[PDB]
Symmetry: D2
Subunit: 250 residues, 4 copies
């Protein structure tokens, strides 16, 4: 069994690849930084069980993994883009195009690249990592929320067509997952260190903590296990019960 996780250094990347590798999958990894062979090799060294690739675009990635490692059983589309808050009238339209490009066109492209081999084999699992920002409670986050909702809906729609070919499709919509060193999207600092941030988490999440990479990994790996294919089409709101607002005052 062979899996690909994109953007492996950020967001859901490491939790997914590490937990998948432990489950006995051969895991190919993608990252922008794997353009430079310095970076690739420093990552191959640190992580001898993972298999990082130079390939950058969806179709050359799928073919490169398919050449080397067999045939893709699992796609984890771990999509990232900078959120910077701003009012609608300030954004340029070309900004929304880039947002949709990173968060929405990308997973479609990866699914579209892998789908016909999975269908031929009548097996595969496809998992988009999106965000709980979809129809979420934020303001001035509009380009981001909407592109993520695009990607979740794409997952749910694909499930309906690929079910016939025995391929479950899932979206994982996180909030408050500790991203460690990565800025996408809850780096240990300021989130574990700054008392103002720590107070925000305890205020608005039900479990009053950040989620761990390992939780995000365990979920990815359960979905990819073949244990619960019948959940196909589910968007999983991995957000520790966010949002939680307080009772009326006084």
């Amino acid at each position: 069994s062979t899996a690909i996780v994109t953007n492996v250094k950020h967001f859901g990347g490491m939790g997914s690849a590490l937990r998948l590798s432990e489950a006995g999958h051969t895991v190919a990894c993608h990252d922008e930084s794997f353009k430079h062979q310095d970076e690739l090799e420093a990552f191959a060294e640190t992580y001898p069980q993972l298999i990082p690739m130079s390939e950058q675009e969806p179709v050359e990635l799928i073919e490169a993994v398919t050449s080397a490692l067999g045939h893709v059983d699992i796609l984890v589309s771990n999509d990232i883009a900078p959120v910077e808050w701003r009012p609608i009238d300030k954004y340029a339209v070309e900004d929304y195009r880039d947002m949709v490009e990173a968060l929405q066109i990308k997973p479609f492209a990866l699914a579209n690249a892998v789908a016909s081999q999975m269908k031929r084999r009548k097996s595969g699992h496809i998992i988009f990592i999106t965000s709980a920002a979809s129809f979420g409670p934020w303001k001035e986050l509009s380009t981001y929320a909407s592109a993520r909702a695009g990607a979740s809906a794409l997952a749910n729609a694909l499930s309906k067509e690929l079910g016939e070919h025995n391929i479950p499709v899932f979206a994982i919509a996180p909030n408050g997952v500790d991203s460690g060193d990565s800025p996408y999207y809850y780096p240990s600092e300021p989130w574990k260190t700054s008392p103002e941030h720590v107070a925000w988490v305890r205020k608005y999440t039900a479990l009053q903590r950040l989620g761990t990479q390992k939780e995000l990994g365990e979920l990815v790996t359960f979905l990819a296990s073949g244990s619960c294919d019948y959940l196909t089409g589910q968007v999983f709101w991995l957000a520790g019960g966010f949002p939680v607002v307080e009772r009326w005052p006084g």
Copy 2:
């Protein structure tokens, strides 16, 4: 009150422009065909209460209207694309981009063009006409259903930023609305006349009929009326109770 309805000849376009007009709004209408004087004037003539414009692109359309008529109070982004079923791998990625450009970047670009002027007065209404396909029961409609959910989510997200500024934002997510002569998306032929289509409707919708332009224009006009701004952020599933599924055999 001045309103712009885009793609007025299609989908929800005529219901909206007509029902808005009938309530007192001054309605500027956009359409691809209005690129032609002849097509424009035929419309103007058939519809003397409406004010067809020729402009095609968001910034230019917004400014044309703001000149002619002084300001834009109401945006109805009546967005349309060809609903073509292919398996996901039968598509090219550029087809998804085109669908996203028509259904998602378009209404963003209109919103972004009119926003700062609505924000200045602390008043306005923004309505996106999307589709019930968004998180719906269909297969091989993957590009369409997901682009439509992006638009709907974009409306809901904007309602949250623009509420500060007293600007309600909505989406209307239709299914089965009789669109008369327009192929978007339920032309009266074959949907009122061909027994299978008639049957499909009867099977799968709760009220067992097509929806009407009037029903849709009435909703647009209600949301625009200022009577219930507090509904801001709502996505309206205008789908006659679709989908309905038979009991166990």
Copy 3:
């Protein structure tokens, strides 16, 4: 055209009945206090256009209105019950039974009483007033949130069966609607007067105000107009964009 609004002195009651009366409906009104003819008559006097009834239970109410005023075209089930926040282990089970009785059994009972005449006539509209507390962001509100979600789901399910008989069914799920003198659920005081409450509203709602009775009335009346029957099965979240949480701090 004849309409009934229950619990007319509270929650959505007056906005609905007053706005419906203006639309040309003959409006029968129900209230617990109409048990005492003092109260009935003081209300009939104040509101000569409305038609208050003594009848208390669903079936005697429907028959009493049907006898006097013709035939019920519109039911507005304006359901109320005390919310008092509490942890699960504190509630007695019998409390949850009373909650479900008031918020869930009641609308079913009213629908079940009116449905067979509407179906015979192939016309009628049925509107439950529920709450945005359903799957909402509160904690320790659990009995209330769940009974309201029961009533919204009941509306959506009824729409699917009664559509065949040309009867649209709707739920209106409010939050932050000014209830004036009524404690159900946002009385002018403390909500319009107490600076702490005023600050809470401006914080967590998008429009940064309470909604008016008149807005809640206008919606009821549009749905009941016969203008947009195709919306049948919709739950309307009349909550001015609540909830809105703030950006990450710092």
Copy 4:
């Protein structure tokens, strides 16, 4: 870790008890039939890893288990009622009360019985097995679909209060799960053997099969495992992609 599964012979009951056991949990099982020594011991004998109890009522069942086994870490409220289609006016209000009592007051009463002890240790998991009927595509299932949504909403509401206390709460909302010999709700006959039922499944579910007990027990066991507490509040639509609707004819 000690777990209670209610109504173990039905619906999601056997998948849960078996898969939990197989993972190491000590599983106490409840069932209406265990009111009978004979029925109880036949079960015990067939299933030596499980620990059938005789108690019937929430407070008494919770306390029986807490004595026998010291504490309750995991509650799986596997609730069942007869799914009988009548038009809404064909019902009596008391039938709705009974459905609500079985599907909604029951899991509340179990939650409320076990809560204070989970809260004391700051640990536990609560899982309600509800149904995808909740906001679903059916007609004349009005009592059932609405009671199931109440239960699901109750789980989500509790996840928000009990998170402070480190207690994850979930609902699992199934459709089309092969229930073997149980009539709740997809017995292998006629659903694996009768051509129409086989066809109905193939038409309306995405994966075109029934779901399995194993698939459901695996989910219960995963949620109970403590591996992904951060999913708390989730309602799981375990429905093979149901509903799926045909394209236009």
